[PDB]
Symmetry: C3
Subunit: 53 residues, 3 copies
């Protein structure tokens, strides 16, 4: 394990572990516990072609 | 982001942005916008076990 | 390809190529042909949010 979720998902401004903000889904994430980044999107968008596309 | 789609998907010989060739899907890709490589297959084939397998 | 399945999945104690043990799947992995690791889980668990979650 040389890579962590820090290079794919980053903790949101408030809902990085709560899953919600102010009672509603955070503008960046919605109950995920972080947010997607350039790498995460590449590793997700690419897999979205062989998994969901 | 320290990694790009270049280490997973490479532009096809002709259909790297068109998604098709001569009205027909490229022998390597079929409207994807690139092609899969050894790394892409490992990162896709491995996820195909926890997503599609 | 600069990465292999060795940084995501490793051969199990017995069912790394058999896919089964004593007539039953390995306690650590099922007829998969290996086992999940910390990296594989991160690359799978993260994709499990954009693919299965
Ligand atoms: Zn958020
Ligand atoms: Zn092609
Ligand atoms: Zn096993």
């Amino acid at each position: 394990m040389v890579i962590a979720t820090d290079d794919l998902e980053v903790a949101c401004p408030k809902c990085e572990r709560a899953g919600e903000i102010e009672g509603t889904p955070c503008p960046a994430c919605s109950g995920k516990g972080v947010i997607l980044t350039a790498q995460g999107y590449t590793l997700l968008d690419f897999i979205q072609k062989h998994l969901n596309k």
